[PDB]
C-alpha cells in the first residue's frame, strides 16, 4: 500500500501526524480537508503533499477542544467559512504603505484595507488566540490570515460588501475592553447628579458626530469623562475637514452610482490618504469622512 507522512490540524499549532493511504481521497480519511484554503476533500494525496500541513473539521473531543481554545467559538461552520476566505484572501497583495500593511483592492475589500490600516495603529488585546497571533502576523507584512478570520468572525465572505464601523465593532466585542469607561453627568439645574457609567465595548465607540473636541464639550446636555485606549467616532458620511495632528486616523466613504467606496486617512507626520495600494500625501483634506478613530497618550 502507498502512503504518504502527513499533519493534520485545527489550530496550525497542534500537529497531528497522519499516515494517507494513496489509493483514497482525503475526504473518505479524513472527512472535509482543506489545504491552505483549498478544498481537497475529493483530492487524493499527491507526492507533493508529503509532510504538510491539512486543516480537518473538528469531529472529535481532541480537536473540539483545541479549536474552542484557539478561535474562542462553537459554530460549526467556522473553520470550514473561514477556509473559504483564506482561499481567496491568500491571493490578494498586501503592499506596505507608509510603514503600515495595507490591502490592494479586490473583491471589493476597501473597508476590510480600511479597517486593517486602522487596526494596526490602535492597541487592542484580542481574547481568541486565533486573532492575536494572526493580528501580529498582519502587523509584519501577513495579514491573509487575519482578513480571512476577520471574515469568518464577522459572518461576511469574500466580494461582500462591508461596513468599518460595523467590522471594528464586532472585532471590539472579541477583544479585552473591561478598563474602558466612559462616565456620562446630565447637565442641567433642577434634575441635581445624574450619572451613568458605560464600560467596556461601548465604551469606546459613539455614533452622531465625528469631533470628540466637540463631544467633549458637550452632547439633553451631557459632560463626559472618557477612560479608553482609543475611542471610535462615527457619523453619516458628510464633508468633513481633517486637521493634523487633531486625530489619528479616519474613514472616507463614497458613494458614487450607490456603489461604495473607501479610504483611509492617518494623521502622521503630514496627512496620508491610503486607497489599498495607492497613497497621496496632502497637508489638508476634505472629503466625506464616516468615522474618526481617537488615541489616548
Ligand atoms: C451612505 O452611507 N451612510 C452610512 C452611515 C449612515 C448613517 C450613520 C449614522 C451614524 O450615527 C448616527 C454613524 C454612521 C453612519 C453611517 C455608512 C457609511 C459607511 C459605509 N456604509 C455602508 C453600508 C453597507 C456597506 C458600507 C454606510
Request: hydrophobic share 35%; net charge neutral; aromatic share 12%.
Amino acid at each position: 500500500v502507498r502512503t504518504i507522512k502527513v499533519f493534520t490540524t485545527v489550530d496550525n499549532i497542534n500537529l497531528h501526524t497522519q499516515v494517507v493511504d494513496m489509493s483514497m481521497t482525503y475526504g473518505q480519511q479524513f472527512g472535509p480537508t482543506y489545504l491552505d484554503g483549498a478544498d481537497v476533500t475529493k483530492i487524493k494525496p499527491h507526492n507533493s503533499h508529503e509532510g504538510k500541513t491539512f486543516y480537518v473539521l473538528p469531529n472529535d473531543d481532541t480537536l473540539r477542544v483545541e479549536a474552542f481554545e484557539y478561535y474562542h467559538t462553537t459554530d460549526p461552520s467556522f473553520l470550514g467559512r473561514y477556509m473559504s476566505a483564506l482561499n481567496h484572501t491568500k491571493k490578494w497583495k498586501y503592499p506596505q504603505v507608509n510603514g503600515l500593511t495595507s490591502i490592494k483592492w479586490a473583491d471589493n475589500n476597501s473597508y476590510l484595507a480600511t479597517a486593517l490600516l486602522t487596526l494596526q495603529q490602535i492597541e487592542l488585546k484580542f481574547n481568541p488566540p486565533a486573532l492575536q497571533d494572526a493580528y501580529y502576523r498582519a502587523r509584519a507584512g501577513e495579514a491573509a490570515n487575519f482578513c480571512a478570520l476577520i471574515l469568518a468572525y464577522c459572518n461576511k465572505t469574500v466580494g461582500e460588501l462591508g461596513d468599518v464601523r460595523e467590522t471594528m465593532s464586532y472585532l471590539f466585542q472579541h477583544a479585552n475592553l473591561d478598563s474602558c469607561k466612559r462616565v456620562l453627568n446630565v447637565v442641567c439645574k433642577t434634575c441635581g447628579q445624574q450619572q451613568t457609567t458605560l464600560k467596556g465595548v461601548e465604551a469606546v465607540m459613539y455614533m452622531g458626530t465625528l469631533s470628540y473636541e466637540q463631544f467633549k464639550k458637550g452632547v439633553t446636555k451631557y459632560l463626559v469623562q472618557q477612560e479608553s485606549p482609543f475611542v471610535m467616532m462615527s457619523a453619516p458620511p458628510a464633508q468633513y475637514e481633517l486637521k493634523h495632528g487633531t486625530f489619528t486616523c479616519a474613514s472616507e466613504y463614497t458613494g458614487n452610482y450607490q456603489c461604495g467606496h473607501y479610504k483611509h486617512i492617518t494623521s502622521k507626520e503630514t496627512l496620508y490618504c491610503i486607497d489599498g495600494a495607492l497613497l497621496t500625501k496632502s497637508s489638508e483634506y476634505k472629503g466625506p469622512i464616516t468615522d474618526v478613530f481617537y488615541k489616548e497618550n
